[PDB]
């Protein structure tokens, strides 16, 4: 399987661009950036609100937990490649603790509001607007040969007051190369596409469009996560109990995928649950025919059948957003 778009990006570009292992990091000054307050944490880093002592300007200090040299260069190269494109987190500097060599990445500051607190207050229009902003990040990075591979609310920073969106955490991101077999141990469980769950290694940008779709489905339906699986096999069961088993069946045969008998048994047999079955009084005001139609073209088993980030941005759903530009 190849990408239906931007397949030749890293092919027509110099080896400098995509060859991240040849990166030689030009380290900055660790004294320039003081920690003010903790603002988050994850498996691979701790994150702090910071200050630049030169200019008194706020920043984000992302202190990294012991990481392989290979993986950290991947994150940096991608960050440097994408630095400047639409709604991408801007990497300001790269520094290290002299004694222990622990790297820190310094980012632009964003006054983010947690999605568990923010999202319930988003109106019909705000949702349209912020997904559109995310779509700009996605098409940009896709256009540059990068798949984010970890699209979720936690990686989407939002200052509601100033209406600014930044796509963050490019720790799982990767250069797309035509027919290169990739590790399916990427994204976070509730946003893993069916390609990763069934061991289809030759995936592409399309992966991020599934992830995007789970995120979107949770926002309009007010049910986050939308696909709540307990583990990788249960994650697929949850998808199958929505999109239906037949669509799964045709998808698997098209790519010559054989499922594990353990998994195939677990999945079982299920009919399709129409999207309108997720409507209620808590969410009636965010669900529309346009929302449903957009959601519908994103959440497809077949990665080749999903809307591309560019196609998605032109959807009548986002029309009023486009007119305001
Ligand atoms: S974790 C984590 N949290 C976080 C925040 Br709150 C911001 Br504003 C920013 Br800009 C970044 Br890069 C991260 N990572």
Q: 179 C-alpha vs ligand 1 centroid, how far in Å? A: 33
3-state secondary structure 115-165: HHHHHHHCCHHHHHHHHHHHHHHHHHHHHCCEECCCCCHHHEEEECCCCEE
3-state secondary structure 214-274: HHHHHHHHCCCCCCCCCCHHHHHHHHHHHHCHHHHHHHHHHCCCCCCHHHHHHHCCCCCCC
* CB distance 168 to ligand 1 below 6 Å: yes
Q: Which pair of structure tokens corresponds to residue 150?
A: 């970890």
DSSP string, 43-56: SSEEEEEEEETTTT
CA angle 56, 62, 65 (to 5 degrees): 145
Instruction: Name the residue of 106, 168, 169 whose CB sits within 8 Å of the most ligand 1 atoms, as the mutation to test its pocket.
Output: 168
The architecture that CATH gives domain 1-18+110-325 is Orthogonal Bundle (1.10)
DSSP code for 213 = H
Q: Which pair of structure tokens corresponds to residue 316?
A: 């009548």
What sign does the dihedral 209-212-213-214 (CA atoms) show? positive
Binding-site residue numbers are 39-47, 62
56: number of Cβ within 10 Å: 7
Quick check: 108 and 40 in contact, CB under 8 A? Answer: no
What Rg do the C-alpha atoms of the chain give, in angstroms?
A: 20
Q: 270 C-alpha vs ligand 1 centroid, how far in Å? A: 40
CA dihedral angle for residue 137, residue 142, residue 145, residue 148, rounded to 10 degrees: 60
Quick check: 45 and 67 in contact, CB under 8 A? Answer: no
Binding-site residue numbers for ATP are 39-47, 62
Coil, helix or strand at residue 72: helix
CA dihedral angle for residue 185, residue 188, residue 189, residue 194, rounded to 10 degrees: -60
- The question of whether 150 is a catalytic residue gets the answer yes
Choosing from 32, 97, 126, 150, which is the catalytic residue?
150
* CB distance 110 to ligand 1 below 6 Å: yes
* CB distance 104 to ligand 1 below 6 Å: no
The architecture that CATH gives domain 19-109 is 2-Layer Sandwich (3.30)
Q: Which pair of structure tokens corresponds to residue 178?
A: 């035509």
Closest CA relative to residue 153, chosen from 222, 88, 211, 239: 211
Omega before 163 within 30 of 0, i.e. cis: no
273: number of Cβ within 10 Å: 12
Q: Give the N- to C-terminal CA distance of the chain in Å, as an integer.
A: 36
64 CB-near residues (< 8 Å, 6+ apart): 44, 45, 72, 102, 103, 104, 105
47 DSSP β-pair partners: 40, 62
User: Which sequence spans correspond to the domains of the chain?
Assistant: 1-18+110-325, 19-109
Method used to solve the structure:
X-ray
């Amino acid at each position: 399987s190849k990408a239906r778009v931007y397949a030749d990006v890293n092919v027509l570009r110099p080896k400098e661009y995509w060859d991240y292992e040849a990166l030689t990091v030009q380290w900055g000054e660790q004294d320039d950036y003081e920690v003010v307050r903790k603002v988050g944490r994850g498996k691979y880093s701790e994150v702090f609100e910071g200050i630049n002592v030169n200019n008194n300007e706020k920043c984000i200090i992302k202190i990294l937990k012991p990481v392989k040299k290979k993986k950290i260069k991947r994150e940096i190269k991608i960050l440097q490649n994408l630095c400047g494109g639409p709604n991408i987190v801007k990497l300001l500097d790269i520094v290290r603790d002299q004694h222990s060599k622990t790297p820190s990445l310094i980012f632009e500051y964003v006054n983010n509001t947690d999605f568990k607190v923010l999202y319930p207050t988003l109106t019909d229009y705000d949702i349209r607007y912020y997904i559109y902003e995310l779509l700009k990040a996605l098409d940009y990075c896709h256009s540059q040969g990068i798949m984010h591979r970890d699209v979720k609310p936690h990686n989407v920073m939002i200052d509601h007051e100033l209406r600014k969106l930044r796509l963050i955490d490019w720790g799982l991101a990767e250069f797309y190369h035509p027919g290169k077999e990739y590790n399916v141990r990427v994204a976070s469980r509730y946003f893993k596409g069916p390609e990763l769950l069934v061991d289809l290694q030759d995936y592409d940008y399309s992966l991020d469009m599934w992830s995007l779709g789970c995120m979107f489905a949770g926002m309009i339906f007010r049910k986050e996560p939308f696909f709540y699986g307990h583990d990788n096999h249960d994650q697929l069961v949850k998808i199958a109990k929505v999109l239906g088993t037949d669509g799964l069946n045709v998808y698997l045969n098209k790519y010559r995928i054989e499922l594990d008998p353990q998994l195939e048994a677990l999945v079982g047999r299920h009919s399709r649950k129409p999207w309108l079955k997720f409507m209620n009084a808590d969410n009636q005001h965010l669900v529309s025919p346009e929302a449903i139609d957009f959601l519908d073209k994103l959440l497809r088993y077949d990665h080749q059948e999903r809307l591309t980030a560019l196609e998605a941005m032109t959807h009548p759903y986002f029309q009023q957003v486009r007119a305001a530009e």
